[PDB]
Subunit: 439 residues, 4 copies
């Protein structure tokens, strides 16, 4: 008698519709009911064997020659649903400057343009944007016409927040793909596959070595070795491969997670998913994704629980799955302005829209940089540099305080600069900082 | 001309050779004439040689061949020689570097013999230890040896030669050790060479006492004593990958059928850029070498030991620029028939140059097993953490003063301190720690504190 | 006498009329109890206008708690509680501490508020004793309307919670002697509690004794031994009015003491003490006795004395200035000075287990440390804390407002081995700090100090 | 009047009890030095405005240059003698011994350079010009030691010492404690050394007195063409190089036509009232360079006559554990007034470039200037011709410090003002441009990064 009083106010929100909106109105609610019923009804015994999961072994099978073929039976979807307010800039996380002078969105059409103009193929790109991103990104999709690209944008369902005392439904909502109708469209043409990559990941290009094991199974989940850097994240139970998340872990076995190995598994969020298998699961309602609590409180109101599902959670529902190892070449997500300084450096070379780590960086290791609190805002980031320094021979960089960089600087080895509170530190142009502590 | 000003520097030492203290005469004549013998070669003083994939072998291919059975093995073919001719004033200490404490507190010397004991006291064998110490270190090291009686290890000493500090502007003499190439002649001349080959030992294993990871390894020894169907070995060179940590050293190449050594100075100007990547040079001179005893006798008799002349500048401290003619051990493989060096894990090369290495190596990051220490887990990534202590921390006494115990490091990646900083008991460093106390200020870090990804100003 | 008692009469006449004015002001149908309130002011005022040294206190009038504690506890049933009334003093906000609201609603431990811990205490009586103790709160216009909306949380519990408001009085002028168009303190209780129609309800329900304490005193708790002493008393005397007293620390010389004046007890406070002998009050101790404001009072006794106007309490002056205004007086009274009027009145000397005023954040810390343990809503110093010694904690002005206090300590540090603490300026503690010995943490203007998580500061001066 | 002769002959006998303590052979020079004083003290006891200097008596170097060069051969050099002023240490720069011996570039010492010059002269021209050094009791034996090194360079070198005088006391008026009596003491010493008669015997006719600070003191052919084979007939005798005043160099010496001849004037000689008009109004554009051209012939003629008129420079000095005392001296320039036909010629600042302090060094060992065969001249592309202004602090004063602070001399072509003070260091390959102020307050350090370009900046 305690779920029958929330649904009665979910019937009291249908008559507050603006007459026209009724097609996707009675449906988005009827999804919340399918997941609110799983809220109040809520191993270790199997470890992943050798016969399940390497990169350099597929390359020796290895590459189908040549045109195309095969490049024509595929669709490319990159995620959008997400602001970059954490970055600073109000608006979609797609519309921020990366390399002079392209943005995330620009970098993606750059990649597709090179393949179309060389393999004679026409591969359509797709955005899965949220309600906070569609108004803006739609207005700028006009500057992409007359480029050899097909474009297909569509929204995600709207979900009602609920209160602790008495929002986007996560990235796993891709429920929506059948709702817009493009599911039925894409299949009935010749395509058989969908490639999901995040837009934050800039290494997540479409691979031709993997397109061998795909073309001429079904479900591919890409993986990379865990590193001290990124500890928490997603990692074969009872026949099928099951996704395991940080929050699902019982109280006892927290020490067993992370340490040691044990596990090498990490969630890449780069997936290939078969089209014809979606309709065998989306219609019979057998997709089993796990739903997470995710209750924050911002800014000056009660604690709110926002229920969301995960993309990689539907392996337990898919049949005949197997994952393959992908070297860190093809995983490079950008989160803070400290990543921006990294990627826009002469650490990466730029080639037809997709970027790779450069020569001659002698050792193949990312030199990660920690920028201070006063660099977090992208508008402040560019203020303080403009003239992204030389970093081909840098190992560690840490700046904190009111610091400014002149043009053409070179950073080498370990550089530490720390201005005290209400001090300014002005690095002169052309300067070469090598293993130095600038207080 | 070049002779007529060389016969001056030869009759300039005839005045000091009569300034000889009766007995100490023949080991004085022997050296000074061996100084002339270098000075001569000093006046006269590729590339097509790309290194081969057959001589230089991976460790992984020896280690699993593999274990020599049984009793035992023989091992009684080996001699462990360790270089002990180095002062430790860069670490702060007046005297031999060997006598600096590393753990609990075993000294450098302590730790070696504790290995040789665990061998002999488990394999019913008698392996010797041989130290080469120069005139700097011989005195002080001898007095502190009486503590090793009734340890199952026979220990032997012999001195490096004594050459004159020649003048840059003057090219005339007024004292230094000729490096570590001097071994071949000074080890023969002591008499020890003939002893060991007389006991039937045929293989000597040189290394640096600095290299705490330089441990006697069975798997390699098996490749040597009773070798794989073939000939060899007159000489072996342990060699590791190049790290950003150490960009200048030696590289081993194949110039003219035999493998040569190349030093950074031997490089003419229009090719210095080329050395150390393009990465067709991931060879690093570890300085951990095996040699054959039988081999040394032959080649030393006929002066058939060819090394490149090292020419070091220093004017330090007060006075004119000084010229030190030296020779290295490596620069003499090309004069040994049939050479090959193998590739070795960095596990086997852990040299303790600064006070910053001490920290690393006496932390809970390494676990000790009576002498020989290893990178013991829990440790997640294999990566060696960066540690850079300031100038307030160089002299050992200061370093030891500053730490009231050595802080936990098993989950550290980078740590940099500078200033008058001072630690506590049970301190736990995790992530990237930066602690900097400015000219006049002092930071003392409270006991049992956990600094994790922080910056203390 | 001649020219002095004409002016005095014209003062009491002038105000009265400017108060006959502020009566119909005010022309609100809801008169209850306005006219009475203003008849209480003129009673105080008339006294203010018209307006030692004697003996030390006798050795049988004040008694040690151990003598009484060991007699010992009642036997039946008991069921001696059924003649008791607990009364908590809720006339006061926490704007001192810095909180929008009644002090009675700030959280202490895990994280129950002063009043939570109070009802948890009574619940636990009634539960283990199949008894029904009534709880009364004597609050003010400041405190009532706010707490009433919350009192519905204590539903389904085993308490009957009761309320009343004590009067409003208007604040008189220090220059002009004129009312501006305040709660007269805890001393007003007698009148207000009776007028509220509760004194009579309970007397006619079989109660005989009232236990008055503060809400700020987390230690002031119902004690079966001191209860045994009034209910079924020794010999048959028959008292009436009993006031808990303690021994004076350096911590509190500025309090009130009991002394025999002309044949009865009287509470003598800092203020009424002559200019020449102010020192001899503080020392020697000697006068080692100090008022706790834990009181036990007979209900029968109130009526007899109330309905007959005879509770003689000393008048306090209390000059205040706030905010952009000149000087205003304010007339108040104190429970304690009532002893004077009662009969067979006596005081018992108490441990300080029973006296913990949570007045500052300094006090809060201590009381949410590991230096105490919470059991059924009451808390007491806990073993193992070896030396019985009580630490002294002085926090800085940066720690005054509770909202700050919480954020500055990521956790509550381990105490138990504190002797002295003194923090002043901009500091901050992390998770799992352990403090022992004497800890001094001074940070100057413009500086920060962040004690890292897990630190153990023993006898250090951090700067 | 009668007291003066009393205090003048009291001095006579007091010195007479000091000869009686002279080491056998030292005497014949010690006495002549002491009779040198007798005369100066005698002048010192007995001790405008109409002076504004004419047109024709001071000439612009450009006219002279355009006449121009000697033809034969020349080999006009044969009649010249180069004299460089040595007496004078470099303790104010933070150096022991002779200032002559400080490293300027490569490092060539001050003296390394002037021989480097004379030599290149003799070698290109097949002539053998001599270098004579006038050092004093402080910079003599120290210099002679180093002279061994110039063997087998093509320069005959010489030395002589100027006199040594007694320090007389402020209150007492008695002598004590010895000093070299100014550079003006060149006429007397040069005569007594005998070189003067020696040289006028080998048929030399002229000396070129100049200073070893002066790096710009080139031997210039056009001035020579004017002295040997003079145009028109006359015939003079004394020539004073002379330049323009900068706000920099205002308090100097200027020529004026006092009573017939030219006469030098020093700020110390000017009446209190008129001090404002000397040192501007310019008016006095002329400023003394102390590069002089003098006839050997003429010296001798007038020295036998004791006719050389200099003014007494009265000096007050008391350092460090001494008491207040006077130190009577004379100036070389001062002597125009007694020579004949004397003229001054105005000369580019190129010829005038003294390195008196550590600021100056930085400037001269820059890439602003350029070095060839010992001589150095500013050069390209120093586009706007003006000389940049450098004020290093009291930290950079000592030569030994100055070098430790500059891990490399920095670029200065584009530099207009540089001013530092406090505890500062410089990386290598620094470039300075425009106006650069770097100021480090007591207790601080500024370390400039290598490769830095400071362009119009304040670094505090």
């Amino acid at each position: 008698e305690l779920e029958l009083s929330v649904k009665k106010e979910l019937e009291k929100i249908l008559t507050t519709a603006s007459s026209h909106e009724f097609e996707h109105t009675k449906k988005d609610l009827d999804g919340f009911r399918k997941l609110f019923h799983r809220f109040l009804q809520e191993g270790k015994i199997q470890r992943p064997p050798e016969d399940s999961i390497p990169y350099e072994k597929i390359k020796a099978r290895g590459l189908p020659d040549n045109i195309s073929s095969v490049l024509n039976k595929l669709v490319v979807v990159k995620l959008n649903g997400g602001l970059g307010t954490s970055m600073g800039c109000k608006g979609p996380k797609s519309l921020i400057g990366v390399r002079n002078e392209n943005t995330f969105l620009d970098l993606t059409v750059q990649q597709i343009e090179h393949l179309n103009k060389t393999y004679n193929t026409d591969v359509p790109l797709v955005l899965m944007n949220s309600f906070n991103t569609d108004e803006d990104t739609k207005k700028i999709l006009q500057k992409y016409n007359h480029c050899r690209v097909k474009i297909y944008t569509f929204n995600q369902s709207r979900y009602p927040r609920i209160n602790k005392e008495s929002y986007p439904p996560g990235h796993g909502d891709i429920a929506s793909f059948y709702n817009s109708g493009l599911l039925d469209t894409f299949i009935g043409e010749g395509k058989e596959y969908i490639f999901v990559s995040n837009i934050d990941n800039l290494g997540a290009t479409v691979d031709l070595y993997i397109l061998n094991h795909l073309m001429n199974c079904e479900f591919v989940m890409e993986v990379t070795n865990k590193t001290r850097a990124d500890v928490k994240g997603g990692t074969q139970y009872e026949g099928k491969l099951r996704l395991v998340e940080i929050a699902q872990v019982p109280k006892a076995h927290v020490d067993e997670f992370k340490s040691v190995s044990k596990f090498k598994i990490f969630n890449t969020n780069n997936l290939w998913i078969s089209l014809a298998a979606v309709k065998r699961l989306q219609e019979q309602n057998a997709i089993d994704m796990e739903i997470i609590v995710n209750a924050k409180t911002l800014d000056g109101g009660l604690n709110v629980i926002q229920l969301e599902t995960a993309v990689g959670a539907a392996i337990k529902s898919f049949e005949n799955s197997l994952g393959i190892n992908v070297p860190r070449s093809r995983f490079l997500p950008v989160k803070t302005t400290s990543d921006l300084l990294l990627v826009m450096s002469n650490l990466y070379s730029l080639n037809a829209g997709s970027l790779t780590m450069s020569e001659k960086r002698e050792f193949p290791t990312v030199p990660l940089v920690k920028l201070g609190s006063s660099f977090t805002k992208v508008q402040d980031y560019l203020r303080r540099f403009e003239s992204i320094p030389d970093m081909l021979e840098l190992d560690h960089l840490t700046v904190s305080g009111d610091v400014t960089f002149g043009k053409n600087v070179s950073l080498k080895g370990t550089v530490i600069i720390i201005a005290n509170h209400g001090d300014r530190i002005d690095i002169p142009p052309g300067a070469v900082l090598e293993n130095k502590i600038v207080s």
